[PDB]
Every structure is written in structure tokens, then in C-alpha cells.
Design a protein around this nucleic acid. Structure first.
Length: 52
DNA sequence: GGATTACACCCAAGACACCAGGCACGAGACAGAAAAAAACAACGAAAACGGCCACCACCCAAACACACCAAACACAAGA
């Protein structure tokens, strides 16, 4: 979970780099790609390979 | 620095890339580089003042001699 959540926070940074340039208010519900942690946990528990 | 580490067989389970900066084209600005002109060096022409030979007179150089001093064989002294 630590690995996958640092992935997610890096995505949030990469997104706030672009969207903020537009100079708009953003609701953060399009800023988090929730599928990263879900897909990672599911991949590890379904394959056994413990990691990205 | 690499390279190799038993042989045969059975079963199950998941994936069979997604997403992000570079090539082309897509347009500005100082730098990669090109054109010019004005204060840089020299040379031609005129002006008059510094340079060369006279003229010149007083100050330093040579001769004469003075007395004075430094000096050198040797008759005498001496160990």
C-alpha cells in the first residue's frame, strides 16, 4: 500500500502541474485515478508477486 | 568481469502493455555570422625657427722654476 499510494500521490502532483496552468478551480475528484491502488492490490493478491 | 547448479510426470491461476514527451512543423531573438564608416596609420605641400659657420674674449692648460718630500745602495753599526 505504501508503494501504491506514493504512486498515487505522484499522479496527483503530475496532474496539478498541468491543470493549475489553466488557472481554474478543480474538485479533485478527477485528479485521483482510484484504479491505481485497486489494480495494484488486486494484481499482487491475484498473482502473488509482491510489488508493482 | 561471467557461468553452471538432477530426471520424469500431474494439477491450478493470471495476462495476452496504456499514456505520456519527442519529430515536424510552427512562429520570435541574440547570437553565429555579414556590411559599413570614422577615427586610426601613413604621406604631399607650406612656414618659420632651430642648426651650422663666424666672430669673438676671458678662463683653463702647459712651461719654468722654487722648496719639499719620498726613496734607494751602502758604510757603518749591530746579533
Amino acid at each position: 500500500f505504501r508503494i501504491l499510494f506514493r504512486k498515487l500521490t505522484r499522479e496527483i502532483y503530475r496532474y496539478m502541474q498541468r491543470c493549475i496552468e489553466t488557472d481554474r478551480d478543480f474538485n479533485l475528484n478527477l485528479a485521483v485515478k482510484s484504479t491505481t491502488i485497486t489494480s495494484g492490490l488486486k494484481y499482487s493478491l491475484a498473482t502473488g508477486n509482491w510489488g508493482e
